[PDB]
Amino acid sequence: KGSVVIVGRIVLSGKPAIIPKK
Amino acid sequence: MGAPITAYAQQTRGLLGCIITSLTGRDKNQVEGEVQIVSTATQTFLATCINGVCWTVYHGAGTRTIASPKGPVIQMYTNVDQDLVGWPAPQGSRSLTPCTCGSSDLYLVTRHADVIPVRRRGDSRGSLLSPRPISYLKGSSGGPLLCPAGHAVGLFRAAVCTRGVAKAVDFIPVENLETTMRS
Ligand SMILES: *[C@@](=O)([C]([C][C][C])[N]C(=O)[C]1[C][C]2[C]N1C(=O)[C]([C]1[C][C][C][C][C]1)[N]C(=O)[C][C]C1=[C][C]=[C]C(=[C]1)O[C][C]O2)C(=O)[N][C]C(=O)[N][C](C(=O)N([C])[C])C1=[C][C]=[C][C]=[C]1
Ligand SMILES: [Zn+2]
Helix, strand or coil, X not given: CCCEEEEEXXXXXXXXXXXXXX | CCCCCCCEEEXXXXXXXXXXXXXXXXXXXXXXXXXXXXXXXXCEEEEEEECCEEEEEHHHHCCCCEEEECEEECCCEEECCCCXXXXXXXXXXXXXXXXXXXXXXXXXECCCCCEEEEEECCCCEEEEEEEEEHHHHCCCCCCEEECCCCCEEEEEEEEEEECCEEEEEEEEEHHHHHHHHHC
């Protein structure tokens, strides 16, 4: 039977940030 | 994390890449975050890392291994009745810690990185303050129910819907995790 595969992540540890201009 | 609960999602694998990895059982990708979006060849759900263990619903993962950089990994715990399975947390993930304040004001984090308020109404039940269509909760089993301080209270298990809209949610309280580990 096939393994369970991680296909993405949800990150709770992020804090508001000024999106760097680049 | 902590103060106001905010979350973001990032996709890391595609359909073909996921299939190959599911079969080879070897995932070389870097892991980050507390909640991992996972998939089998039949469905996609979530898995949450709490205290060093990656937990999810047995309804989704069944008794499968988790693809890792070292090959597939056997589950540490399995509890068909409690609907749980856990594997060692992937290297790179960050774990949540159980809630220690008995708050009845929960926040469910969905696979789309939305945190929706849920009012605790019974240890393993909570009502959606803002009913959402069932399709919105699909794919979020195994996701976390957080207390205002960002601590795991439970893992989303089932939607209490009617006519296609979910009014409430059933979840697996952290206490059952400890019980599954102890059992
Ligand atoms: C979860 O495992 C999933 C999320 C629910 C929206 N949970 C379930 O399927 C559980 C397992 C069950 C039955 N359910 C329910 O939530 C059902 C619900 C009824 C309406 C239609 C959806 C299912 N609810 C009930 O049975 C109510 C009775 C009840 C009340 C309390 C407790 C229980 C039952 O416990 C018994 C629970 O039994 C999840 O996210 N699963 C993965 C998933 O849905 N994946 C799909 C997918 O990958 N494909 C369809 C391919 C998905 C859909 C859409 C988007 C992304 C993924
Ligand atoms: Zn708490």
